[PDB]
């Protein structure tokens, strides 16, 4: 029927837009790395590239938004929740917002600064839903935008099921099973289009291509590792709430402090500029980025944190882990560099999601949880270098498995959802740690819900969204 | 809070009851096989055991129900849907119903006759929910029984996520996200208890232990096999509707034909008796069960149909497939024996779900879809004995992968749900065929929804449930 065509169009267009963004953002990241390596000998020149490439891209993001649509800043979820609660802001679903968000997000994702695709994609998909609906019908709203949410999350990273589930939770409170199936169909169409696009251009982009883990796990699961996975959850819920709190505190700070707001309104590009500069100066690989793997960009970070190696075991011999050899520092022990990645990227992600550019929170917190989980798993590997015997089987610790759990847990404590476990499963391509993950994400949600709001609901508060 | 304790109690009790049933049903299946092998030389004696063991157990199931609670017959879902639509039948949620359903289902699952655990478990879990609620609070209803549905499906086979998702779809139309999370927590508790029970008794039972597939799949997926997976879906939707239709036709038949109803009301144990006898006489291994793998009981059937072997390749040398050597018949080609399994078990499952015992539809249709999918995959392996080259990679056909898709598709066309894909993923322990499965189950649902009702809604019609 006409609604079936709407969903086919949704999936198709979303996947196309998502792939295009991912392509150009990856080409920009490739240029970033190439330019940086073209300046190899000279350190000041290396610094220049390392800070100006992101600076230009983030300044462009902010400026483009301000010029075209300044309502295309931030994530989309908080405001889509407002729209879905009846209070529709009609400048959000405009084509100017589309263009602004699309181009500016591409620039933000090709900068390497921790901003997120997940979140703004769902706004891009809700604008696309609204536009597609008009193009079809005129040439209800909640239904249309709920499916837009599903396909936004689904087309972002390549997670049909997890995306629909995420939508149901992040936006509505009482979903309809029709919209669950409508979103399902549309998200699977998005995935199919994504697969054929990754055939035409032989992949080399996206995040479905990567993040695919190759863990060799034994069937029964070491239940003695369950306490550590439960601990990941508890602590990720605590840290998820800390993220939400601190992000809201800096979000409020920049506007509630009168001097701050006035200054940054006179000079609009001051805030994004200085934030980008300091993040990039701390992630400068020969500066502080040697103790926090600053060379690694968001997607490479996960690819490495989700590896089937034990960094603390193969520290004497690096380059056997491949791209995960940047975690092994000559002097500093791996564990401490993952700790420093986590600490540095915590504050970096807090202030980059406060920047006036289209920015989401999932991916920044995903890399943070992967770091936290890996740290736990590498410590577990030090505590058990022989593995833990539960039944009669010895289970060598998979620190990368712990990282997947942590990613889902921290990002589920920030978004107050349990569907991040499913997103992780599909992004990772494996479901071996199903019980450990479920436990962790539930525990994370519990702790975080008992402490702070969700990233989205807290932003609603700061932005005084009607709701 | 008190609701958190309710969910902990739900999960705990459900897992305990489910495990206990599974244990005794497996011990009964072990005795069945042992007794049959104790009669090895004599064929009439072998026949006796092969038909009387199930006969006694099914007759007991029917009689026990009739005596204790004759409202503990059939599945639970259709009637739980009625209760959840406001029209509460209060003899359904009694403790007499609990006992009847529990004991009689154990007997039915230890008989080897295609009856299902999934379906009656959700009634057992809704009774348990009601009882637990009273034990806690007195010593709303929809919320309670919706979570009961989630944990029923979840604790049945060991599928937390898939179970909650199934519940949302099979019962309500507009679920609440609170109940989604409440069901999630309770189902993960069930899974945790299940894991520790499978540690205390070193597993050897359940279905989470088995069904775990070991497919070695290449990352990009052969998109040329996608047409065959889509075909599985289309055809499984057709056959799903045929199942629903024919089941309703025999369900009506036995009561709408006045002579039939009168006869079977005078002799209550006639219908179950004759049906059990004829199913078991056709599944007699030296009789017709050599051309349809009748030796295999429901769970072994899937374990074999979900194997990583190609039966049509290793036909000259059997016993390399292990328990899947019963599919290789000396004379009849594997493909035709899977076809005959499918045909025979189609009608067998249609009439065993019409029997007056606690019986569900998922598992019977799950084995049917696994058979259909395997047949498709084995034919695909004959058509491509070298594999299909898509990109530059040759992809050897995994007929067992096709079986997992088919299982989810036929059971998703019978239940009108897309969550069977998730159930399959978790039961199989692998999510490699995510896109192929999604496509298939969506296509199945589409075709089946355009043809017949769901098994549950059709039963509602036959049983004239208020709804």
Short mmCIF file of N, CA and C in Angstrom, two decimals, chain B residues 381-447:
data_model
loop_
_atom_site.label_atom_id
_atom_site.label_comp_id
_atom_site.label_asym_id
_atom_site.label_seq_id
_atom_site.Cartn_x
_atom_site.Cartn_y
_atom_site.Cartn_z
N UNK B 381 22.74 -26.50 -2.59
CA UNK B 381 24.07 -27.10 -2.58
C UNK B 381 24.24 -28.02 -3.76
N UNK B 382 23.16 -28.59 -4.26
CA UNK B 382 23.24 -29.42 -5.45
C UNK B 382 23.42 -28.52 -6.65
N UNK B 383 22.69 -27.41 -6.67
CA UNK B 383 22.79 -26.47 -7.78
C UNK B 383 24.14 -25.81 -7.80
N UNK B 384 24.72 -25.62 -6.63
CA UNK B 384 26.03 -24.98 -6.53
C UNK B 384 26.97 -25.83 -5.70
N UNK B 385 27.54 -26.94 -6.30
CA UNK B 385 28.38 -27.73 -5.39
C UNK B 385 29.73 -27.11 -5.19
N UNK B 386 30.00 -26.01 -5.88
CA UNK B 386 31.28 -25.34 -5.79
C UNK B 386 31.09 -24.09 -4.97
N UNK B 387 29.84 -23.68 -4.82
CA UNK B 387 29.56 -22.46 -4.10
C UNK B 387 29.28 -21.37 -5.10
N UNK B 388 28.76 -20.24 -4.62
CA UNK B 388 28.48 -19.12 -5.50
C UNK B 388 29.48 -18.00 -5.30
N UNK B 389 30.06 -17.51 -6.39
CA UNK B 389 30.97 -16.39 -6.28
C UNK B 389 30.20 -15.10 -6.46
N UNK B 390 30.25 -14.22 -5.47
CA UNK B 390 29.60 -12.93 -5.62
C UNK B 390 30.61 -11.86 -5.95
N UNK B 391 31.45 -11.53 -4.98
CA UNK B 391 32.46 -10.51 -5.19
C UNK B 391 33.65 -11.18 -5.82
N UNK B 392 34.52 -11.73 -5.00
CA UNK B 392 35.67 -12.45 -5.50
C UNK B 392 35.75 -13.64 -4.59
N UNK B 393 34.81 -13.70 -3.65
CA UNK B 393 34.79 -14.80 -2.70
C UNK B 393 33.77 -15.83 -3.09
N UNK B 394 34.15 -17.10 -3.03
CA UNK B 394 33.20 -18.16 -3.30
C UNK B 394 32.56 -18.51 -1.98
N UNK B 395 31.24 -18.62 -1.98
CA UNK B 395 30.54 -18.90 -0.74
C UNK B 395 29.88 -20.24 -0.81
N UNK B 396 30.49 -21.24 -0.17
CA UNK B 396 29.90 -22.56 -0.13
C UNK B 396 28.57 -22.49 0.60
N UNK B 397 27.55 -23.13 0.06
CA UNK B 397 26.23 -23.08 0.66
C UNK B 397 26.18 -23.72 2.03
N UNK B 398 25.62 -23.02 3.02
CA UNK B 398 25.44 -23.60 4.34
C UNK B 398 23.96 -24.05 4.44
N UNK B 399 23.62 -25.35 4.16
CA UNK B 399 22.19 -25.68 4.21
C UNK B 399 21.58 -25.52 5.59
N UNK B 400 22.38 -25.61 6.65
CA UNK B 400 21.89 -25.44 7.99
C UNK B 400 21.56 -24.00 8.28
N UNK B 401 22.24 -23.08 7.61
CA UNK B 401 21.94 -21.67 7.78
C UNK B 401 20.59 -21.41 7.19
N UNK B 402 20.31 -22.01 6.04
CA UNK B 402 19.01 -21.87 5.40
C UNK B 402 17.93 -22.42 6.30
N UNK B 403 18.24 -23.48 7.04
CA UNK B 403 17.28 -24.06 7.96
C UNK B 403 16.90 -23.11 9.09
N UNK B 404 17.86 -22.40 9.65
CA UNK B 404 17.56 -21.42 10.69
C UNK B 404 16.64 -20.34 10.15
N UNK B 405 16.92 -19.85 8.95
CA UNK B 405 16.06 -18.86 8.33
C UNK B 405 14.66 -19.40 8.15
N UNK B 406 14.54 -20.60 7.60
CA UNK B 406 13.24 -21.20 7.40
C UNK B 406 12.46 -21.41 8.67
N UNK B 407 13.13 -21.83 9.73
CA UNK B 407 12.47 -22.02 11.01
C UNK B 407 11.83 -20.73 11.43
N UNK B 408 12.60 -19.66 11.48
CA UNK B 408 12.08 -18.36 11.85
C UNK B 408 10.98 -17.87 10.94
N UNK B 409 11.11 -18.14 9.65
CA UNK B 409 10.12 -17.66 8.70
C UNK B 409 8.79 -18.39 8.82
N UNK B 410 8.80 -19.71 8.96
CA UNK B 410 7.54 -20.43 9.02
C UNK B 410 6.86 -20.16 10.33
N UNK B 411 7.64 -20.11 11.40
CA UNK B 411 7.06 -19.85 12.71
C UNK B 411 6.69 -18.38 12.87
N UNK B 412 7.21 -17.51 12.02
CA UNK B 412 6.84 -16.11 12.05
C UNK B 412 5.64 -15.86 11.18
N UNK B 413 5.38 -16.77 10.25
CA UNK B 413 4.21 -16.66 9.41
C UNK B 413 3.02 -17.30 10.09
N UNK B 414 3.28 -18.19 11.03
CA UNK B 414 2.20 -18.85 11.75
C UNK B 414 1.77 -17.96 12.89
N UNK B 415 2.72 -17.30 13.54
CA UNK B 415 2.41 -16.47 14.68
C UNK B 415 2.23 -15.02 14.30
N UNK B 416 2.48 -14.68 13.04
CA UNK B 416 2.39 -13.30 12.57
C UNK B 416 3.30 -12.37 13.34
N UNK B 417 4.54 -12.80 13.57
CA UNK B 417 5.51 -11.98 14.28
C UNK B 417 6.84 -11.98 13.58
N UNK B 418 7.64 -10.96 13.83
CA UNK B 418 8.96 -10.90 13.24
C UNK B 418 10.01 -11.12 14.31
N UNK B 419 9.57 -11.40 15.53
CA UNK B 419 10.49 -11.59 16.64
C UNK B 419 11.03 -12.99 16.68
N UNK B 420 10.54 -13.84 15.79
CA UNK B 420 11.02 -15.21 15.72
C UNK B 420 12.41 -15.20 15.16
N UNK B 421 12.75 -14.16 14.40
CA UNK B 421 14.10 -14.03 13.89
C UNK B 421 15.04 -13.87 15.06
N UNK B 422 14.68 -13.01 16.01
CA UNK B 422 15.49 -12.80 17.20
C UNK B 422 15.54 -14.04 18.07
N UNK B 423 14.41 -14.73 18.21
CA UNK B 423 14.40 -15.97 18.96
C UNK B 423 15.39 -16.93 18.33
N UNK B 424 15.33 -17.07 17.01
CA UNK B 424 16.25 -17.94 16.31
C UNK B 424 17.68 -17.54 16.55
N UNK B 425 18.00 -16.27 16.38
CA UNK B 425 19.36 -15.79 16.59
C UNK B 425 19.91 -16.22 17.92
N UNK B 426 19.15 -15.99 18.98
CA UNK B 426 19.61 -16.33 20.32
C UNK B 426 19.66 -17.83 20.56
N UNK B 427 18.69 -18.58 20.04
CA UNK B 427 18.68 -20.03 20.19
C UNK B 427 19.82 -20.65 19.43
N UNK B 428 20.22 -20.02 18.34
CA UNK B 428 21.25 -20.57 17.49
C UNK B 428 22.61 -20.07 17.96
N UNK B 429 22.61 -18.98 18.70
CA UNK B 429 23.85 -18.44 19.23
C UNK B 429 24.62 -17.64 18.21
N UNK B 430 24.06 -17.46 17.03
CA UNK B 430 24.76 -16.75 15.97
C UNK B 430 23.85 -15.77 15.25
N UNK B 431 24.41 -14.67 14.76
CA UNK B 431 23.61 -13.64 14.10
C UNK B 431 24.19 -13.30 12.74
N UNK B 432 24.85 -14.25 12.10
CA UNK B 432 25.50 -13.98 10.82
C UNK B 432 24.50 -13.74 9.71
N UNK B 433 23.44 -14.52 9.68
CA UNK B 433 22.43 -14.38 8.64
C UNK B 433 21.38 -13.38 9.07
N UNK B 434 21.80 -12.22 9.57
CA UNK B 434 20.83 -11.26 10.08
C UNK B 434 19.95 -10.67 8.98
N UNK B 435 20.55 -10.10 7.95
CA UNK B 435 19.78 -9.57 6.83
C UNK B 435 18.97 -10.65 6.12
N UNK B 436 19.60 -11.78 5.72
CA UNK B 436 18.75 -12.81 5.12
C UNK B 436 17.53 -13.18 5.96
N UNK B 437 17.69 -13.34 7.27
CA UNK B 437 16.58 -13.71 8.13
C UNK B 437 15.53 -12.63 8.18
N UNK B 438 15.94 -11.39 8.41
CA UNK B 438 15.01 -10.29 8.47
C UNK B 438 14.16 -10.25 7.22
N UNK B 439 14.79 -10.24 6.06
CA UNK B 439 14.06 -10.25 4.80
C UNK B 439 13.05 -11.38 4.77
N UNK B 440 13.50 -12.60 5.01
CA UNK B 440 12.62 -13.76 4.98
C UNK B 440 11.43 -13.66 5.91
N UNK B 441 11.65 -13.31 7.17
CA UNK B 441 10.55 -13.26 8.12
C UNK B 441 9.58 -12.14 7.77
N UNK B 442 10.08 -11.02 7.28
CA UNK B 442 9.20 -9.94 6.84
C UNK B 442 8.36 -10.43 5.67
N UNK B 443 8.99 -11.05 4.68
CA UNK B 443 8.27 -11.58 3.54
C UNK B 443 7.26 -12.63 3.95
N UNK B 444 7.63 -13.49 4.88
CA UNK B 444 6.73 -14.52 5.36
C UNK B 444 5.53 -13.90 6.00
N UNK B 445 5.77 -12.96 6.90
CA UNK B 445 4.68 -12.28 7.58
C UNK B 445 3.77 -11.65 6.57
N UNK B 446 4.32 -10.91 5.62
CA UNK B 446 3.52 -10.26 4.59
C UNK B 446 2.60 -11.23 3.87
N UNK B 447 3.17 -12.28 3.29
CA UNK B 447 2.36 -13.27 2.59
C UNK B 447 1.30 -13.88 3.51
#
